[PDB]
């Protein structure tokens, strides 16, 4: 996800939990050279990242 650049990791977990209803075992963000922040959030194994992404319209 591009995620708000001022957001931190713990807030991105709490946001995935609320927006997409899924746990994030980890969320290591980077801010892009362009200035957008980019989170790679890894889901808990109990949550598929595939079943969820397609549910997301992706």
């Amino acid at each position: 996800f591009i995620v708000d650049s001022n957001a931190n990791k713990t807030e991105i977990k709490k946001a995935m939990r609320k927006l997409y209803q899924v746990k994030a075992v980890k969320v290591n963000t980077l801010i892009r050279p362009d200035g957008l922040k980019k989170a790679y959030i890894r889901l808990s194994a109990s949550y598929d990242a595939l079943e969820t992404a397609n549910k997301m319209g992706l």
Partner: protein, 50 residues
């Protein structure tokens, strides 16, 4: 090198996404004046010394 205050990274980030050719469709508007971007920057030429 690696070191950048994020404030400088936000500025090079700013100038980076600002460093783009004018949209094609903008030239097709009525009364349009713009053709080329007059503020294209190149790292090897103009320096954004931050």
């Amino acid at each position: 090198g690696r070191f950048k205050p994020l404030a400088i990274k936000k500025k090079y980030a700013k100038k980076l996404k600002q460093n783009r050719p004018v949209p094609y469709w903008i030239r097709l508007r009525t009364g349009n004046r713009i053709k080329w971007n007059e503020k294209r920057r190149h790292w090897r030429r103009t320096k954004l010394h931050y």
